Every structure is written in C-alpha cells, then in structure tokens.
Amino acid sequence: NVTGLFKDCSKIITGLHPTQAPTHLSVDIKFKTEGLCVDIPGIPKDMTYRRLISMMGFKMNYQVNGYPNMFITREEAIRHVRAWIGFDVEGCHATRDAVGTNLPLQLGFSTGVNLVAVPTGYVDTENNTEFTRVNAKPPPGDQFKHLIPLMYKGLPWNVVRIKIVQMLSDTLKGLSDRVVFVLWAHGFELTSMKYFVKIGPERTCCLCDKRATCFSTSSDTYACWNHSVGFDYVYNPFMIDVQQWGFTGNLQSNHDQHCQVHGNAHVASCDAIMTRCLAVHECFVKRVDWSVEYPIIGDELRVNSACRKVQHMVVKSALLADKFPVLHDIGNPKAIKCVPQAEVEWKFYDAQPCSDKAYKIEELFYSYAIHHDKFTDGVCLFWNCNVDRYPANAIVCRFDTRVLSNLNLPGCDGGSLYVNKHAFHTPAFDKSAFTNLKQLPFFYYSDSPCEYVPLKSATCITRCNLGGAVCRHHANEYRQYLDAYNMMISAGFSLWIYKQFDTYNLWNTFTR
Amino acid sequence: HAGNATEVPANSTVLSFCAFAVDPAKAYKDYLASGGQPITNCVKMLCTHTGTGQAITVTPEANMDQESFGGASCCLYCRCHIDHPNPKGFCDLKGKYVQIPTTCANDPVGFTLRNTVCTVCGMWKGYGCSCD
Ligand SMILES: [Zn+2]
Ligand SMILES: [Zn+2]
Ligand SMILES: [Zn+2]
C-alpha cells in the first residue's frame, strides 16, 4: 500500500511543486493528471518552506554483498554477550509547526546512563534537509509528567552522540570488539540510532587493527573501542529484539517474573537494564550451554589452572584425611574426576547431565529444602555449583559475585554472569548458605618422594617438615601452590569445608 | 496518526540502507549490484517532448529520446533526507527538472549519481554532448 517511513508531518495544506517534491505521492494534486505530473508555471514553486519528516518506519532487510546485517540471530547474541548493552529511548511528540512523529528525548542504557537530548528532527526545506530543533511535548499521560523537566535541560545532538560513543567505549573496550544493542520493541530505538549510527562494510581502526566500532565524520576515519576518542558516531552495531523471541505481556511482566532487584522507575535506563536482565535469564539462567565458547579477554588461563590445582589438592587431601567411602560430585555435567587416582566411590550428579556419556550422571537439581537429608554417606563436592544452603558434609568453592572484573558481568536478581571460558550464571553470594560449614584454612599436602634461600612453614604438611627439611622439590611445589591458592582467593573465590576437617589427619600419615 | 505519507514499501528497504550509510552513493550502487530494485515513485512529467536536450532545466525539456523528471525526486540525498556532498550543501537538482534518457530512465536516481553535466552545453556528458 503505502509506508510510514518519511511521513510528511507538516501542517501545510498543499503539495510540493513537482520540482521540490521528493516523491510522486508528495506532489500536489493540482499538478497531477492521468498518472503523471505536469509543470503548471501558473502555480509557481514555493520560495520557502519547512516540512518535518518522520524517521519512524525503518526496515533494515538489506542483503548487500559486503555489508554486515545489523540484526542478529539469538545464537549470535549469546555468542557475543559482553557486547550486550541495553537500549531504551523515551520520546516526545512533534507539536506546533507539525505533528505526527516522535523525537528522542531520553536515551537510556544498561549502564546507569541517561542522556537527555534536545528534541531535534529532520526538516525538508527548499534547498536541503535540515537537522534542527523541533517543537515537541511529552506524551499526554500522567506517568509521563517526569519528562516535562527534561524538555528544558538536556543537550545538543552534537554532544549526545559523542557521549554515547564515549560511554560505550569505556564500557566495552576490554570486553568485546562490537556492540549489541538489546532492545524490547525495536521501532523507536532503531529510529533513534539514525541520530548516531552510520553503517557500511566492515572496516578497521586507524593505528589498531581491531574491528572499527566508531566513525569520525570530522575526519573520515575509523576506530576500535580503545582509540574512539573524539569520534562521534557508532559504526557497525548489532542488535537484537528480545520481545520478538516469543513473550507474553509487557517488559515489566516478563522481567519481574525472573527478578526482584532491578526496580522499575519509569526512567529510560531502567527499561534498558530490565531488557538486558530478561535476555540474560532466557539464555544463561536457562542452564549452561557448554558448546558455546568465549575467547580470552585477559588473565583467565592463570585463574583456571589455579582453580584446578587447588581443587585437586583439597579434594585429594580430604579423602585421605577423613577416608570418605563415597564422593557425591554435585554439579559435574561431564564424567571428569578432579582426583582421578582415588579409591573412593565417585558418583556424579547434575541438572544438565551431558548426553555424551549420560549414563554416568544422575540427573539432579540440588535444593536444601529437598535433599538436606539425602546425601548422608561420605562427602559432597560443590565446586562452583551454587545452591541454597549447603549440607554440613561438603567441600565447597563459591564465586563472590561482588568482585569486579572483565569476566564478571551483571545478571539476574543480584547475581552475575561470570564468563570465563564458557558462561556461568552465578547467584549472588549469600553468607547464610555456609551455616553448616567452616571457612577452609590454607594448607599444602604432599606424600610424594623428595629431592637461593629456603623457607619453613607450619602449613606445609609434608613428610619432610618435622623440623628442617626445606626439601627443595617440595619447597617449590609448596610455593607454587601457595601462589595458585592466593590467585584464586583474590580472583574472588571462596572456600568452605565440613567442620571436622583437620590437618592432623594429614600429619598423621607421617607420624606413623 | 496524522501526516500525509510520502513513500511506497518498495523503497522502504533501499532507503533505510542509504539513510544510515557512511557513503550513500556507494551504498546505493552496491545495493543495485546486489540485485535490489532502484528507487521508484519519482516525479515523471507529462511533457510535449520537444524541448532542449539540456540536463538541468527550469521547466520540462525532454526529447523523444528522454523523459523529464521532478529533480528533487531524482536526487538520492533528497530521497533519503540526508546531507548533500555540496560543501555549501544546496541541492543542484531541487527546484528544477531533470532530463533522463528513456533507455536509462528505469533508474532516475542512479542515473543522476552516476553521470555528470557539461559546464559548457548543459547536457549530460555521454548522453547528448556535442563537444570533442
Ligand atoms: Zn533485573
Ligand atoms: Zn538533493
Ligand atoms: Zn559540452
């Protein structure tokens, strides 16, 4: 039929002289005959005019050979969290000189940021199209009266777009090489992007080699997130419309079903935050996908080897110390033993029992409410398997969500998405889950064979420590373990263990 | 909602792409090479077809060989409601009529991007120039 894109919102009651008209449909009926237009010199062209043009109605379906597609699949959105940034814009209505289109007023991001803009819009004139201030008003309702003060204050689009580039740059420069705007109803937000997004074939950053994420109109050049300073436009963005996945009611509804922290003020950024929150829940709270792998953005390899070295020492030692008959490995989707050479019966449990070797894992979602009396025999292992209250007979490792890093991103409730290798949604650290446990003190244990300045320590439990044996081999191994242990402590991980754990059970293997 | 509309869902995609592009000219050309259909809904003139061959004229001046169009509608930058590359920035085709070879009048907008006007005779180089 006819589109809404570029709707002339002007209160003018005539047409646009065949010469000043941009389209056939915009020409005044006074020059239209038998399907064509005709130059009637007695009806002269307009010397001057100003017609507000609606920029609502963009459709970005293009499939052009060298150009990236702005909208992405749910798969890519997940593949590239980090890059996710929530985006919601509150507008205002065109009103005196024109009417029938919305202008950006408050731009909200899933950072805490709210940028207020001068209501500007696109005006077609007799010579060119001008980008200028447009008369506007906040939407009619009562819940929109908070936008009345914002019709004053605010600032120039000159600025607002630089601020956006800067804001995104700071947020994303150590996380991704792109940006993915996370949208609820993409219409108006895509319109707002016209005001600060340019697109084209992929490019790379001046100086750097990374992907260009920004563009300077000032001097036709491109930038990554680390060099984009003074750059005014976002260059190739990506975006995802969350509601299009398949949702019931409004944003407020679906979000609050899965979250009690992000309170909704009527302000733009809250809707942005909530939008992201919801998307995270539908991809990361809906349990872990181990086939999706994420790249190293920094110092992950050192944390992971520390985590395993410690995991091994602690579980190895507790099994020798208290001679448990059974080890209940809760939270292991694979069939991998952290102490593969132990005599104990090793049972595996998980909510996502990997299909490839499904037979070795009992499907289970642990709840204290349910299983508090079920795993009585032996010891339970919860190494980054975050539950409700933990059972007294347990060895536990839990990530403190409050620790900031490039790996720890915001998530549901009060928790977070720890994205090391693979993405792990971790529920907020709750002190009372460890009621039944003891915080695990530092120790080192080795029953291995033995071999500028040496050190003595009481925490080194080794056959060569009964008074002077800095045993060069196990001096090193101790000092390395010590570093690994401290790595993971300061990396945010917390260790707890059954109260009966006693290092004399370990010393006793040597006092004999 | 008010307003008196402007465009046809045909141009809706083509235009969104060039509006957002860094280089609209390049974008449009690439778009067409990628199989997209050229911008339509232009201002085509009912004309005697007896006028001077000149490209940019005050009133319609088509030949039997040409068609006459309402200049602004043949200008990519006017159709996208974006900035013009004229450093001063006033469109050279708005408020005038544009003469386009019937053989090339399939794509008015592209035709004006792709071609150039002779400063001496006022006719398109290659499409009606008597110099050289
Ligand atoms: Zn939330
Ligand atoms: Zn133009
Ligand atoms: Zn000539």
Numbering used by the authors:
A (entry chain A): 3 to 453, 465 to 525
B (entry chain M): 0 to 131
Provide the authors' own sentences about this structure as they appear in the paper.
To achieve accuracy, CoVs have acquired nsp14, a bifunctional enzyme able to methylate the viral RNA cap [methyltransferase (MTase)] and excise erroneous mutagenic nucleotides inserted by nsp12. Nsp14 is organized in two functional domains: the ExoN domain at its N terminus, which interacts with nsp10, and the N7-MTase domain at its C terminus. Moreover, since nsp14-ExoN belongs to the DEDD 3′-5′ exonuclease superfamily, which includes DNA proofreading enzymes, this activity was proposed to be involved in a CoV RNA proofreading mechanism.
We determined the crystal structure of the nsp10/nsp14 heterodimer by multiwavelength anomalous diffraction (MAD) using the anomalous scattering signal of zinc. The crystal belongs to the space group P212121, with cell dimensions a = 185.97 Å, b = 189.74 Å, c = 195.93 Å, and α = β = γ = 90°, and containing four heterodimers in the asymmetrical unit. Nsp14 is a modular protein composed of two functional domains, bordered on their N terminus by two other structural domains. These four regions are organized as follows: (i) a flexible N terminus forming the major part of contacts with nsp10 (cyan), followed by (ii) the exonuclease domain (orange), (iii) a flexible hinge region formed by a loop and three strands (gray), and (iv) a C terminus N7-MTase domain (pink). Here, the N terminus of nsp10 is stabilized by the first 25 residues of nsp14, forming a clamp that accommodates the first 10 residues of nsp10. In the presence of nsp10, residues of the ExoN active site are correctly positioned and form a highly active ExoN, as judged by the observed distance between catalytic residues. The ExoN and N7-MTase domains of nsp14 are separated by a hinge region that allows significant movements between both domains. Sequence analyses show that amino acids forming the flexible hinge are conserved across Coronavirinae, suggesting that they play a critical and functional role in regulation of the nsp14 hinge region movement. Indeed, this particular structure allows lateral and rotational movements of the C-terminal domain with respect to the N-terminal domain, such that an ∼13 Å deviation is observed from one peptide chain to the other (crystallography and SAXS analysis in Fig. S3). Between the tip of strand β21 and the bottom of helix α9, a third zinc-binding site is found. It is formed by residues Cys452, Cys477, Cys484, and His487.
